[model samples]
Target: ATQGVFTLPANTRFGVTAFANSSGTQTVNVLVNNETAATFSGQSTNNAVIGTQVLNSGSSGKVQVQVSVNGRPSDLVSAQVILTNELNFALVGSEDGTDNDYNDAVVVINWPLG
Candidate 1:
C-alpha cells in the first residue's frame, strides 16, 4: 500500500491513484478535509488503482487524504492541500511493504477563471 499528496490551483481537478500490492480484492477510501470524498474496490493481479477528483477553492481549504485495504483502516497519508495563486504544487507518497505503489497528483484548469 502506498500514498501520495499533491497541491493544485483553485477550482481545479485532482486525480489520485492507489494500487493494491497483493492479490485478492481490496477497498480504498479517500477523504478530503475530514469528510468521505470517494471509495474504490477491485482485484489487483499486480497493481490495483483508484482515483478521486474535486475542485479546489477557499471552502475547500485543506485536503486530508487516507486509504484502506479490504477492511483495514487506512493511515493518514496527507494532512493538508493548499492552493496558491501561483503555479506552486506538491506531491507526496507513503511507502508500503509490497511492490504496490500509490501515485497522486493534481491539475488546475483555466475554465473557472476564464
Candidate 2:
C-alpha cells in the first residue's frame, strides 16, 4: 500500500492519473481520507485518467491519497493525484425550455479566476 497524505483547502477538486508499463492488466485504487474515492484499471503500456472528485464543505483537514496495484506479480506503474482550487460548472438550455429541444450553451470554466 503506497500512500501519501496532504492537506487541501475546502472546495478543492482533484484527480489521479496513472500509467502502467507492464504487459498485463493493472488496477489502481485511490483513497481519500482513508476511504476509497476512485478506482482505475488499465492494460499494458497505457495511461488512464481516474476522474476528479471534490472535497466540499470542510474547514481544514488532511486528505489521504493511497495507491494500490493488483493483477500483476511485479507491477511497474506510476500514479499522481493533482489538486486544484477550481470549480467546474455546466450550463444547458433548450430552445423552448422543453424536452428534445436541448442545445449547447457557452460554458466558461475559470480555474483560479475570480
Candidate 3:
C-alpha cells in the first residue's frame, strides 16, 4: 500500500474536499504516529472534516495517511501526496494500483491562516 507522512506545525486541521466517489468500497484512514485519527469512505459527503478543533501533533508533528480499497485486492490501495504550502499538504489515493491516477480519495492537511 502507498502512504505518506505530513508535518503538523502546531494545531492543524485534517479534512477531505472535492471528494466525489460512489464506489462505496473505498476508505481513507488518517493516522497520527500510527494511531487512527480519522476515517473517510467513498460515499462520504464532500468537504468532510476530521477534527472538531485544530489538532496537536504531540511533539512529533507528523501524520500518516493511507487508503484501503476494501475488497479482494485491498492491498493495492495507495496514495500520492503533495505539499501546497508551509505546513500544508494534500493527498490523493488510487484504488487501482495499475492506473496510478491517484484520484479516488482526496485529503488536506494544513495549519491555520491563508
Any runs in candidate 1 off by more than 4 Å, and if so which? 1-10, 52-58, 74-114
**lDDT tens digits by residue: candidate 2, 1-114:** 432444555555543344444434444444455566665565533333333333331244344433333432231122233346245322211121123221211111112223
Error of 3 at 110 (Å): 2.5
TM-score of each: 0.48, 0.43, 0.59
Of candidates 3 and 1, the better by lDDT = 3
The whole-model C-alpha lDDT of candidate 1 against the native structure comes to 0.43
For model 3, how does the per-residue alpha-carbon lDDT over 18-92 read when each residue is reduced to its tens digit? Answer: 253334445666677668766666554343432222344545656776666654323223233445644444454
Angstrom error of the Cα, residue 105, model 2: value is 37
Candidate 3 colliding pairs: none
Best by lDDT: 3
Q: What TM-score, to 2 decimals, does candidate 2 have?
A: 0.43
Error of 3 at 19 (Å): 1.9
Scored against the true structure, residue 9 in model 3 reaches a CA lDDT of: 57
Q: For residue 9, what is the lDDT in candidate 1?
A: 44
What is the RMSD of candidate 1? 6.2
